[PDB]
Amino acid sequence: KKWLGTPIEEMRKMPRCGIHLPSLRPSASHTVTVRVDLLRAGEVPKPFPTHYKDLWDNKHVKMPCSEQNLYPVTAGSRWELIQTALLNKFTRPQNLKDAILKYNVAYSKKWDFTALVDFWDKVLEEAEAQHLYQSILPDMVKIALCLPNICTQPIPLLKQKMNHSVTMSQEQIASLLANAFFCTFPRRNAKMKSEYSSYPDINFNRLFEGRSSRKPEKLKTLFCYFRRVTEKKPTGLVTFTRQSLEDFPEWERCEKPLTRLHVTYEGTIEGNGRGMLQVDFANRFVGGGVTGAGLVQEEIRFLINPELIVSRLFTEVLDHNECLIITGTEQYSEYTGYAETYRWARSHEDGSEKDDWQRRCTEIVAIDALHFRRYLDQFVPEKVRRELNKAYCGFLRPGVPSENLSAVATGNWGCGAFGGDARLKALIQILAAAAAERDVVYFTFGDSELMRDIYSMHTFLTERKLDVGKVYKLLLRYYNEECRNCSTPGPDIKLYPFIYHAVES
Numbered sequence: 001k002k003w004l005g006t007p008i009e010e011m012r013k014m015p016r017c018g019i020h021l022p023s024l025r026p027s028a029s030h031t032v033t034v035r036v037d038l039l040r041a042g043e044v045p046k047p048f049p050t051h052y053k054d055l056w057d058n059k060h061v062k063m064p065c066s067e068q069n070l071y072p073v074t075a076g077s078r079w080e081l082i083q084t085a086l087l088n089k090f091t092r093p094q095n096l097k098d099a100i101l102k103y104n105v106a107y108s109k110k111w112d113f114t115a116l117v118d119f120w121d122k123v124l125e126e127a128e129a130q131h132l133y134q135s136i137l138p139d140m141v142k143i144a145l146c147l148p149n150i151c152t153q154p155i156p157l158l159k160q161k162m163n164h165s166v167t168m169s170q171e172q173i174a175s176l177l178a179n180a181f182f183c184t185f186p187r188r189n190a191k192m193k194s195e196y197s198s199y200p201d202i203n204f205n206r207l208f209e210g211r212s213s214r215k216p217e218k219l220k221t222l223f224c225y226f227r228r229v230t231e232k233k234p235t236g237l238v239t240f241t242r243q244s245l246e247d248f249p250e251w252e253r254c255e256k257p258l259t260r261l262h263v264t265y266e267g268t269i270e271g272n273g274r275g276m277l278q279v280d281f282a283n284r285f286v287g288g289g290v291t292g293a294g295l296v297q298e299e300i301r302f303l304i305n306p307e308l309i310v311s312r313l314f315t316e317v318l319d320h321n322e323c324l325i326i327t328g329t330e331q332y333s334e335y336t337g338y339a340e341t342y343r344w345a346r347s348h349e350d351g352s353e354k355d356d357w358q359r360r361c362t363e364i365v366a367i368d369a370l371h372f373r374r375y376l377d378q379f380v381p382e383k384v385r386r387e388l389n390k391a392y393c394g395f396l397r398p399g400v401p402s403e404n405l406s407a408v409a410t411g412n413w414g415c416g417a418f419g420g421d422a423r424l425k426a427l428i429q430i431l432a433a434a435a436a437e438r439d440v441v442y443f444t445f446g447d448s449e450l451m452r453d454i455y456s457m458h459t460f461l462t463e464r465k466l467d468v469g470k471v472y473k474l475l476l477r478y479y480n481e482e483c484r485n486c487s488t489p490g491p492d493i494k495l496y497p498f499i500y501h502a503v504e505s
């Protein structure tokens, strides 16, 4: 049997479980960059304000089209330099390289474009390369240079400790990412960098470097997205929300019961978690190394839903008590394989429903697990409380009643690159969801024994009526009784057998 637990169709999904969405209006906590009054279905949103307003300070994104974006000639407008550079024709890779370097002269010998030249000549066919520079690259420049006219409102930086949302259009995002592709964002490339050292990289320069055989598949995935939005302008909105909690459960005395579980070894979070809160196994610098090296769960999601990539422009590094909730992004590509075997399969027509704010019903939460430098560290109670607290922040929607919350679609969070133990992390998530009072759909990603063990454990704890606080205390018991006074890196018994034994006595 390929799944276990509650049947998947008894789990709450959006937009069916949701409360009627109230009128979309700006707020001290909500930035909205489009004309709400003119917002209609299938209609490309209008910007608000109508004409470019500029801020060049330490609270908002520094835009390439700002008058204060200067370069040494006397002080010259780098924006005029960007327009000059890109309005040239592209016949070969060198002409895009030389164009991008005109306004990034400091990095003229730190930036390699080997992956791009190979993609242009070797990987793509002639009719594919010809279509790239005669249609796709020109149409990318048009939307990039229209940034002033499309992004009229300053975009606020989502800093540590801020509970704030920014609601933006897909066309606006299209423009920003087009600018990112051409590496136009100022003050965002420094290594010794001061101001944006706590933000992820935004400019795409590293997408052209290296001799990795997966660089072309990243380009294909992004050029699939760019080709799409260029041809037919997208009409949706995307909300990015930074959540930062101060009051977490007192886990040891939490009387809340466990909730329902559906767990399967077939399918994926994105493929089979439609209308559910889909977890992104993030880096605290959101997006990971999507714009560079790195091609695992987060990056892949960031590439097939590239409108997530723009979050890197305004999202400060996540502290332990924080997550980034992105609602509205569209999936543009399909893929095969994973990491070194990842490949772009084809375009994907997203058939998701949209809400009263014209966002696609796709909620993604970025929560960073801890990167454990050795296996035994994660069982230390403070590391357990941290991961619980991170997941709990990822799942909790205060302001929404629990019966109006979808299930969470998640998986082996923290247990790939970050060396976590899936059984420990599964239980952590199940406990987090229970505190947040939501159901869990778990994808073990091809692992059947893990599915059985997770189900059996959930069932055992449910039928003995043990609450969050009792299970938490068992985890603290596991460390003290079997991990603390431990001879070699491994203890004499694993977590699950310990729980079974300790509860049965």
Ligand SMILES: Nc1ncnc2c1ncn2[C@@H]1O[C@H](COP(=O)(O)OP(=O)(O)OC[C@H]2NC[C@H](O)[C@@H]2O)[C@@H](O)[C@H]1O
Pocket: 267, 268, 269, 270, 281, 282, 283, 287, 288, 289, 294, 296, 297, 298, 299, 369, 410, 411, 412, 413, 414, 415, 416, 417, 418, 419, 420, 443, 444, 445
């Ligand atoms: N699409 C999908 N669905 C469900 N499960 C998946 C999927 N893709 C991968 N996985 C499973 O999740 C596991 C964890 O993936 P990984 O990307 O290693 O997550 P980590 O949290 O360990 O890694 C965090 C780091 N990696 C990329 C980020 O930028 C972080 O720096 C991985 O081993 C797979 O078993």
